[PDB]
Amino acid sequence: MDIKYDVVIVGSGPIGCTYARELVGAGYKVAMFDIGEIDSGLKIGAHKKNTVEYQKNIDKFVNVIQGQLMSVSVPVNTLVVDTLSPTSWQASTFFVRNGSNPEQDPLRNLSGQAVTRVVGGMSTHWTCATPRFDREQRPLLVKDDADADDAEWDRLYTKAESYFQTGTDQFKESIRHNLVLNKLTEEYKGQRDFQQIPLAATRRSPTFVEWSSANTVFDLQNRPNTDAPEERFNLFPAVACERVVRNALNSEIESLHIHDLISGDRFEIKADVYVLTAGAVHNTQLLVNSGFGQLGRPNPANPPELLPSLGSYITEQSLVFCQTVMSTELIDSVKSDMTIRGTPGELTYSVTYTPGASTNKHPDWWNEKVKNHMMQHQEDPLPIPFEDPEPQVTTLFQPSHPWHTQIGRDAFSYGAVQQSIDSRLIVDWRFFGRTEPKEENKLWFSDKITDAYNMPQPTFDFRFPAGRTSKEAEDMMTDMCVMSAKIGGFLPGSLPQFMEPGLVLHLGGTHRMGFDEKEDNCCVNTDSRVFGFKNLFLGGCGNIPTAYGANPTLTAMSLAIKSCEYIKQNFTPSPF
């Protein structure tokens, strides 16, 4: 560890890795600090799903996800357990216990919000969906010139797509995927377009997909090294960043205060530039601990010195979910091109098709896979092959259906895992709604209660706004119900429902971007630079100030990229 770096980046998620790739790339002397530790194997911060065992036993990966999601804010528990033995110790009140947050109102929480503290951050477990926002979801990076704004977005997005290895081809040969995609297309012809979810992933084999992660962006190995002898990068894991120190004029950051979690030591690190990419919640906490915004319960009569909007206008998307069991009609359509004769399990049984026939509803590869499955597994009642990959279908946000949709099998399942109905039949439905930014919706931090890292406890004051937000949300529920009945009926146990506020984990706007601090009620400009401050930059979902439905990580990468352009224009790397 040095005293002095060109850039210091807080957090090693896919956004801090975008800063590193770009800046380590341009020859800056870079350090990265993460509170969490390396635990994805030898590929530092790689996706935990990239092991043969997980992709053979995909129902188990939910436990990984759960094991690294720590709830942000848990109100104090008021369940009545009144069947204790009379000898057992009991309290006469519902006291603060098991780490609960007494500031938190149970009825205005994002009870589902959680954070992850591991190198690679949430990108070690995430679903890899990386859609672009269209104009209506997207921040303006140029006022008054929609084409120049368009041009700038597309250039950033294409570059961001290349860091993540985003593609829309990795599921093209799944029967199940094409079954669903084709029926949805047919049933909505013209009115909605369907496609593969764009995914940051590469297919290694029919049974294996290399899911992208922060490691894909930048491999997080220390440099110089044989492969980049001219580059300078050090990752320090198990290091909690506590505070940035402001100069008296509030125009410059002067140091980063850290705590080595293993040695217990505390340091002050000097850099030319300080980049904070610790998550939409922990960026906020870091700032507030450093005198930005306002510690404690919001009070308007006490107007904050720096960044009045910090932690206001927060957005989290609505989520509705269900699972369906494929219709008989759809399962029978899988074998539509086949001539089936005799009795399965007997030597006279056959199943054949006519290759090339233009009246075949399916291409030859489909019919070959069905034929083989049906002939080698005569004991199974379904035409679907056993290792068939899941669907990954989307119809993207449009003004007429202003929500995002994911139709397939997500590794993050919500209940006990059903065993009675065959998996091949089951389709997941997830519709994500956009939420209006409102000043009243807040993340703020206790001045008295602290977290497990002795930082100020985050606390939420949130309700989905009335008006458009609530109307679209129930219109979204209805849409899911309508659309999903095209594929089949609901799975008992996975009936249509809203999920817990924040389980979806696309929290935005906690440190939101705008052209004008005051006019646009915001904390960073369109270079992601904190207003006032020459050398402090925020990355991540916290920056997005608009109401969006799609998954945000791509877009936040795109912003980080344009942040790094600004850095390169204003700060000179130290000579190697």
Active-site residue, 551 included: yes
Q: Which of 24, 209, 241, 256 binds ligand FDA (CB under 6 A)?
A: 241
435-454 positions binding a second copy, by CB under 8 A: 446, 448-449, 452-453
Q: Give the C-alpha distances (Å, rounded to integers) separating 193 from 411, 418, 537.
A: 25, 31, 38
CB 507 within 8 A of CB 113: yes
Q: Is residue 481 near a second copy by the rule CB under 8 A?
A: yes
List, in order, residues 6 or more apart from 502 with CB less than 8 Å away: 72, 109, 110, 111, 112, 113, 114, 316, 460
Q: Which of 28, 35, 30 is nearest to 11 (CA)?
A: 35
Residue 53 or 519 with smaller CB distance to a second copy? 53
According to CB under 8 A, which one of 150, 298, 421, 517 is a site residue for a second copy? Answer: 421
Q: How far apart are CA 103 and CA 443, in angstroms?
A: 12
Identify residues 356-385 at the interface with a second copy (CB under 8 A): 379-382
Work out what residue 241 binds among a second copy, ligand FDA, ligand 2H5, none; the CB cut-off runs from 5 to 8 Å by kind: ligand FDA
Residue 153 or 464 with smaller CB distance to a second copy: 464
* Residue 52 C-beta: closest distance to a second copy, Å: 5
How many residues touch a second copy under the rule CB under 8 A: the total is 135
Residue 118 assigned as binding residue? yes
Interface segment toward a second copy; rule CB under 8 A; list 54-62, 171-179, 190-198, 335-343? 54-62
By a kind-dependent CB cut-off of 5 to 8 A, residue 11 interacts, out of a second copy, ligand FDA, ligand 2H5, none, with ligand FDA
Distance CA 435, CA 508 (A): 10
- The single-letter DSSP state of residue 59 is G
For tokens 């992601």, the residue is: 528
**Residue 227 neighbours by CB under 8 Å, 6+ apart:** 221
Q: For residue 340, state whether it binds a second copy (rule: CB under 8 A).
A: no
Q: Which two tokens stand for residue 73?
A: 């804010």
**400: helix, strand or coil:** coil
- Main-chain dihedrals φ then ψ at residue 204, nearest 5 degrees: -90, -35
Q: Count CB atoms within 10 A of the CB of residue 53.
A: 8
Q: How far apart are CA 571 and CA 527, in angstroms?
A: 14
Q: Is 242 in the site for a second copy (CB under 8 A)?
A: no
Scanning residues 490 to 529, which ones bind ligand FDA (CB under 6 A)?
A: 505
Nearest approach in angstroms of CB 122 to ligand FDA is 3
- Catalytic residue at 372? no
**Number of residues engaging ligand FDA in binding (CB under 6 A):** 38
Among the listed ranges 381-389, 455-463, 504-512, 516-524, the one in contact with ligand 2H5 (CB under 6 A) is 504-512
Query: Tokens 């297309």 sit at which residue?
Result: 185
Tokens 């057992």 belong to 88
H or E element at residue 541:
none
The catalytic position among 101, 367, 535, 551 is: 551
Which CB, 194 or 412, lies closer to ligand FDA?
412
Q: Which of 177, 282, 401, 506 is catalytic?
A: 506
Contact, 473 vs 318, CB < 8 A?
yes
In the complex, the residues that contact ligand 2H5 under the rule CB under 6 A are 127, 129, 406, 410, 412, 430, 503-506, 551
Q: Which residues are catalytic?
A: 506, 551
In the complex, the residues that contact ligand FDA under the rule CB under 6 A are 10-16, 33-36, 65, 116-119, 121-123, 125-129, 240-241, 277-279, 282, 286, 412, 505, 540-541, 551-553
